[PDB]
């Protein structure tokens, strides 16, 4: 009935279609347990949201870098930010791990106890750190514009769009990494090189992707 990633095969029994982006893609059966599938749903959402955020950073910085605005390419940006400003590397690393460990540990112990971070123990806040679903923590802070509580069918549509754009940005970020590992260039430089000669500048001309 519903579209499967591989037409003809039935979906597995643990993938029903309740999840956003549920195409029955589990050939290694990594999520047969419901708790492990719950944990993997939240890991998929976190990887997807970081990949969307990082991929928009890649694209905007590369658009600003090809046109002569002085922006670095993303494999040089951390070095030129640490060296341009007087920023020491390890202190910014440790402050990042402080803030990220605070937020991520709150998310961890809200997965472990599914309503517990809204007890008022953090500063005075209550029900603004209560979650709504697994990986969907919409209150007043995380959903300030308030789209998860009106037009619930449209909210399911946004869940589908969020998972699809997130998978697309994950394979896009893997693309940036492998693309730079082969070509040694920024990504929109590679896009301009593909627009110059499409028939002759591609992955079958590097000598790396197919070494024959």
């Amino acid at each position: 009935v519903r579209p499967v990633w591989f037409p003809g095969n039935p979906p597995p029994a643990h993938l029903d279609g309740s999840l956003a982006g549920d195409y029955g893609f589990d050939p290694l059966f990594l999520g047969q347990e419901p708790q492990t599938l719950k944990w993997y749903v939240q890991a998929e959402l976190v990887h997807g949201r970081f990949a969307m955020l990082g991929a928009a950073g890649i694209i905007l910085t590369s658009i600003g870098a090809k046109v002569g605005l002085g922006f670095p390419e993303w494999y040089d940006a951390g070095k030129v930010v640490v060296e341009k400003n007087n920023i020491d590397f390890p202190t910014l690393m440790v402050i990042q791990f402080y803030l990220m460990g605070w937020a991520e540990t709150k998310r961890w112990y809200d997965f472990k106890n599914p309503g517990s971070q809204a007890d008022g123990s953090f500063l005075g806040f209550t029900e603004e750190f209560k979650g709504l679903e697994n990986g969907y923590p919409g209150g007043r802070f995380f959903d300030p514009m308030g789209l998860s509580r009106g037009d619930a069918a449209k909210y399911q549509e946004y869940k589908q769009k969020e998972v699809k754009n997130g998978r697309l940005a994950m394979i896009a970020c893997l693309g940036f990494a492998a693309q730079y590992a082969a070509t040694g260039k920024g990504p929109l430089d590679n896009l301009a090189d593909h627009l110059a000669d499409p028939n002759h500048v591609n992955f079958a001309t590097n000598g790396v992707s197919i070494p024959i």
């Binding site: 059966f29 990594l30 999520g31 047969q32 347990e33 492990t36």
Partner: protein
């Protein structure tokens, strides 16, 4: 998948994983701290 993790919970598999972890931890210590005799 439950049965595969039950098999991974068996004694020689866990002994292999744990001795790989312990031996690798000792190997990394002896790499970054070469030849400790005292302290």
């Amino acid at each position: 998948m439950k049965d595969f993790t039950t098999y991974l919970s068996t004694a020689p598999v866990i002994a292999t994983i744990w001795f790989t972890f312990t031996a690798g931890l000792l190997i990394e210590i002896n790499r970054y701290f070469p030849d400790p005799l005292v302290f």
